[PDB]
Each structure stands twice: as C-alpha cells, then as structure tokens.
Design a protein around this ligand. Structure first.
Ligand SMILES: *[C@@H]1O[C@H](CO)[C@@H](O[C@@H]2O[C@H](CO)[C@@H](O[C@@H]3O[C@H](CO[C@H]4O[C@H](CO[C@H]5O[C@H](CO)[C@@H](O)[C@H](O)[C@@H]5O)[C@@H](O)[C@H](O[C@H]5O[C@H](CO)[C@@H](O)[C@H](O)[C@@H]5O)[C@@H]4O)[C@@H](O)[C@H](O[C@H]4O[C@H](CO)[C@@H](O)[C@H](O)[C@@H]4O[C@H]4O[C@H](CO)[C@@H](O)[C@H](O)[C@@H]4O[C@H]4O[C@H](CO)[C@@H](O)[C@H](O)[C@@H]4O)[C@@H]3O)[C@H](O)[C@H]2NC(C)=O)[C@H](O)[C@H]1NC(C)=O
Ligand SMILES: *[C@@H]1O[C@H](CO)[C@@H](O[C@@H]2O[C@H](CO)[C@@H](O[C@@H]3O[C@H](CO[C@H]4O[C@H](CO[C@H]5O[C@H](CO)[C@@H](O)[C@H](O)[C@@H]5O)[C@@H](O)[C@H](O[C@H]5O[C@H](CO)[C@@H](O)[C@H](O)[C@@H]5O)[C@@H]4O)[C@@H](O)[C@H](O[C@H]4O[C@H](CO)[C@@H](O)[C@H](O)[C@@H]4O[C@H]4O[C@H](CO)[C@@H](O)[C@H](O)[C@@H]4O[C@H]4O[C@H](CO)[C@@H](O)[C@H](O)[C@@H]4O)[C@@H]3O)[C@H](O)[C@H]2NC(C)=O)[C@H](O)[C@H]1NC(C)=O
Ligand SMILES: *[C@@H]1O[C@H](CO)[C@@H](O[C@@H]2O[C@H](CO)[C@@H](O)[C@H](O)[C@H]2NC(C)=O)[C@H](O)[C@H]1NC(C)=O
Lengths: 59, 49, 204
C-alpha cells in the first residue's frame, strides 16, 4: 500500500489549490477505511483536513 | 366480519386514507456466491458493513 | 489535546509521555522523524500495529492518555503526536511531544538577542531576532515581552535543528513597526527550557 501525492508545489495567493493522491495496492471502493488529507504547516503540529467515503446507508 | 358477535371470527377493516409505512434493512450486506457445483452456486450471507 | 513540549531520556531508560482532553478510547499516537512523514505507532489505546516493537504501549487513565517507550534507542528520536475522535466525526491532534535520544550531555540553552539595525530602520522596518543554541532536549518554547507586558503579535518561531556539535539550535523572528520600537524602551525575549527560562533584553 503506497500513497503518492501530486499537484502544484507553488501556488499564488487567493487562488485555488488542487492536489491529487494516487493510491496503489488498494481500492478506494473498499469500505474498510476513509480517504482524506492531513496537512502539517512548516515546523508546526498536525491538522486534520477532512475525509469521505462513498460507502453509504439508506438515507 | 363473517360473524360479528362471535369472537372466534376475525374482523376485517378497510381504511379511508392510506397509512405511510417504512420498513428497511439497516444492514448493508454482500453476497458470497459460494460454489457448490457442478453448475450450482449458493448465495451465502457475508459480513455486514 | 495538550501534549508536553519536550521529553528526554538515556538509551535503555523508559519514557512515559501523556495527553489530556481524551474522553473516549479512540486515542492514537504518531511518530514523525524530522524531514519525513508521520507513522502511526499505536491505535485504539494500547493495541499495537504491524512491525511495531512490543516496547510501545498505550494507556488511558481518566481524561489522561499515555504512551510509554521502554529501552530507548537512536531510531526513537522524533516528534510524537497524539490524536483522538471528538464529538460526532471530527478528529484533532495535540501539539505533539518531541522526544530526543541524543548523545550526552544535557546543557542550558544560550541566548543572543540582536536589536534592529540603523539601515533596517531606514526601510521603515524593525525586526528583532533571538538566537537560541546549545540546548538539550531539542524542543524549546520562546516568548516575547515589551518593558513588562508580553507581545503576542509578529511572532515567528521555527522548529529547532541539530548542529555539528550535536547541540540543537533555533531562531525566533519578531517583526514590528519602528513606531512601537522607539516608544517602548526595552524589549525582552524569554526562552523557556525544561521549566527554567533564559531571558535577554535590548534598548536603543
Ligand atoms: C453499501 O456498501 C456497498 C459496498 O459493499 C457500497 O457500494 C459502493 O458504492 C459506491 C458508491 O456508489 C461505489 O462507487 C461507485 O463506483 C462506480 C464504478 O463501480 C464499478 O467499479 C468499481 C471499481 O472497480 C475497480 O476496483 C475493484 C477493487 O479494487 C477491482 O476489483 C476492479 O477490477 C476495478 O479495478 C467496482 O468496485 C464496482 O463493483 C460494484 O458493483 C458491482 C455491480 O456493478 C458489484 O457486483 C460489486 O460487488 C460492487 O458492489 C463496479 O464494478 C462509479 O461509477 C461510481 O461513481 C458514480 O456514482 C457515485 C454514486 O454512486 C457518484 O457519487 C459519482 O459522482 C459517480 O456519479 C457520476 O458518474 C456516473 C458514471 O460514472 C454518472 O452516471 C453519474 O450521473 C455521475 O455523473 C455526473 O456527475 C459527475 C460528477 O459527480 C459529472 O462529472 C458527470 O459529468 C455527470 O454530471 C461510484 O463511485 C462502489 O463501487 C460500491 N461498491 C463497493 C464495493 O464499494 C454502498 O455505497 C453502500 N451503501 C448502500 C446504500 O448500498
Ligand atoms: C353467529 O354468531 C352468533 C353469536 O356470535 C351465534 O348466535 C348464537 O346462536 C345460538 C343458536 O345456535 C344461540 O344459542 C341458542 O340460544 C337460544 C336462546 O337462548 C336464550 O333465550 C332463552 C329464552 O329467553 C326468553 O325466556 C326468558 C324466560 O322467560 C326471558 O327472560 C328472556 O328475556 C327471553 O324472553 C334462554 O333460556 C337462554 O338462556 C340459557 O342459555 C344461555 C346460553 O347458553 C345460558 O347462558 C343461560 O344461562 C341459559 O342456560 C338464552 O338466554 C336457545 O333457545 C338455544 O337452545 C337450543 O339449542 C341448544 C344447543 O345449543 C339445545 O341444547 C337446546 O335444547 C335448544 O334447542 C331447542 O330449540 C330448538 C329450536 O326450537 C329445537 O329444535 C330443539 O329441539 C330444542 O327444543 C326442545 O326443547 C324445548 C325445551 O327445552 C321443547 O320445548 C321443544 O319442544 C324441544 O323438545 C341455543 O342455546 C346463542 O345464544 C347465540 N349467541 C349468543 C351470544 O347469544 C350464531 O349461532 C352464529 N351463526 C353462524 C351462522 O355463525
Ligand atoms: C466470522 O468468522 C470467520 C472465521 O470463521 C471470520 O473470518 C476470519 O476473519 C479474520 C479477520 O479477523 C481473518 O484473519 C481470517 O483469515 C478469517 N478466516 C476465514 C476462514 O475466513 C470472519 O471475519 C467473521 N465475520 C466477519 C467477516 O466479521
């Protein structure tokens, strides 16, 4: 299982930051785990971004 | 009712307005589809997610 | 979640780092080597993952969660973060605890404070830099004050880095306006290392 991040390393202010992770060795369809992001500002602590999953319920 | 004063006979009722009822299976399931051949395949109940 | 800023130990000794604010059992700890990605060393409190030594054990008493590392070694030197589920689905992380398994010997930090220059004031800019070095462990918090009251604005502090002599060093940058620099006579810079603090002050 390997996670490879990709996208612009340099973005201008007030613009839209876009990043894409490419998974290898596992399926995003799998209901065993959620997929999201965690950002760590330079020389600072870990901050949670968010995660989602298509594996739903009846509502 | 077939016989009303008789308590042994059931009483059938007919509604005016229909009553909304919801019945769900709050278990999201999977099918194993195990192979008990030749040619036959049984559908087992897998784990509940 | 509140995680202690620093933690130190000699090889073979056992270290216990705490975390508070966890009302649930969803507590988890992480290990991040400097210049690398974080790795999960524990989950569901005490339970261990694959390829993780027995010497890492999680524990939670009351509202306090605790990690314990016995038999310290070189590869254990890193920053340790704790995290847990909160409320409905949100998750938070602590400030993290920096644990160092560096070679001997322990030593008090050293502070050298430089006031803005004359050429710098000509650019209508004022910046004071605190230089802290030669300390163990490698985690130090820095504070700023003006005359008496503390300064909460313009503070930039960065994670320390190891030197050639194996002693850690860090620098905090305070950028303000020249108006408030000439008005307030003295500027104090407080550097807190393992409880004890080291202070420096400069006035024009
Ligand atoms: C209960 O639990 C189950 C799990 O047990 C949950 O089921 C999961 O539900 C999610 C959500 O729907 C599914 O994701 C969808 O995937 C389909 C494609 O599915 C096929 O491919 C999957 C991947 O296969 C690959 O990986 C596997 C594993 O590694 C590998 O083995 C395989 O070889 C291959 O390499 C397969 O897993 C999948 O199999 C499933 O279905 C089989 C029957 O087909 C069944 O036999 C299997 O057992 C298995 O269950 C299948 O082969 C995506 O197409 C789909 O994306 C659309 O749908 C979602 C909502 O469902 C939507 O949010 C997306 O935006 C997207 O909708 C857009 O695209 C559509 C066309 O692609 C289009 O029709 C839509 O109108 C829409 O288009 C519009 O919007 C977009 C922007 O959104 C716009 O760009 C367009 O222009 C347009 O305007 C889903 O992502 C899982 O696959 C499924 N199964 C599993 C195992 O996870 C279930 O959700 C739970 N809850 C309930 C209530 O059931
Ligand atoms: C659909 O469901 C409904 C209910 O859900 C079913 O309705 C049931 O229908 C059955 C009929 O099969 C009823 O049983 C019969 O009841 C009648 C009437 O009994 C009542 O009234 C009697 C007299 O009342 C009058 O006199 C008094 C005194 O003055 C007065 O105060 C009153 O206001 C009124 O003016 C009472 O004697 C009687 O009380 C007795 O019975 C009670 C019930 O058991 C009991 O609780 C009391 O304590 C007391 O013991 C009651 O209040 C009965 O007359 C009739 O009896 C016949 O059938 C039984 C078998 O069940 C049999 O053993 C008897 O011998 C009798 O058969 C005589 O009459 C036949 C017809 O004429 C005749 O062919 C026979 O040969 C026999 O006659 C012979 O003997 C007499 C002397 O004994 C003689 O003169 C003749 O010449 C001849 O030799 C039944 O018990 C149920 O009551 C009723 N259900 C309810 C809740 O009421 C219906 O069946 C269902 N239908 C379908 C299709 O599903
Ligand atoms: C129902 O019991 C079976 C075992 O009889 C479980 O299947 C095992 O699941 C574990 C995961 O913890 C695997 O390590 C084993 O290899 C599995 N064994 C077999 C024979 O499949 C199963 O997980 C249980 N129900 C579920 C799916 O929750």
């Amino acid at each position: 299982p390997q996670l490879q991040e990709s996208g612009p390393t340099l973005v201008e202010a007030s613009e839209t930051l876009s990043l894409t992770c490419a998974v290898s060795g596992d399926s995003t369809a799998a209901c065993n785990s959620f997929w999201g992001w965690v950002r760590q500002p330079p020389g600072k602590g870990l901050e949670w971004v968010g995660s989602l999953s298509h594996c739903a319920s009846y509502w | 009712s077939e016989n009303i004063t008789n308590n042994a006979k059931n009483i059938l009722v007919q509604f005016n307005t229909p009553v909304q009822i919801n019945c769900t299976r709050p278990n999201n399931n999977t099918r194993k589809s195990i192979r008990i051949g030749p040619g036959q395949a049984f559908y087992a109940t897998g784990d509940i997610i | 979640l509140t995680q202690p800023p620093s933690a130190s130990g000699s090889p073979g000794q056992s270290i216990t780092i705490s975390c508070t604010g966890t009302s649930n059992n969803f507590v988890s700890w992480y290990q991040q080597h400097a210049g690398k990605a974080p790795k999960l060393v524990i989950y569901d409190v005490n339970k261990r993952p694959s390829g993780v030594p027995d010497r890492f054990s999680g524990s939670k008493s009351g509202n306090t969660a605790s990690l314990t590392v016995s038999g310290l070694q070189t590869d254990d030197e890193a920053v340790y973060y704790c995290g847990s589920l909160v409320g409905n689905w949100d998750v938070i992380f602590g400030g993290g605890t920096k644990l160092t398994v560096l070679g001997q010997p322990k030593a008090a930090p050293s502070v050298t404070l430089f006031p803005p220059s004359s050429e710098e004031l000509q650019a209508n800019k004022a910046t004071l830099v605190c230089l802290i070095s030669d300390f163990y462990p490698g985690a130090v918090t820095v504070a700023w004050k003006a005359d008496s009251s503390p300064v909460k604005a313009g503070v930039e502090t960065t994670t320390p880095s190891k030197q050639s002599n194996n002693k850690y060093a860090a620098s905090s940058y305070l950028s303000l306006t020249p108006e408030q620099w000439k008005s307030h006579r003295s500027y104090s810079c407080q550097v807190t290392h393992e409880g004890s603090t080291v202070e420096k002050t400069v006035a024009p």
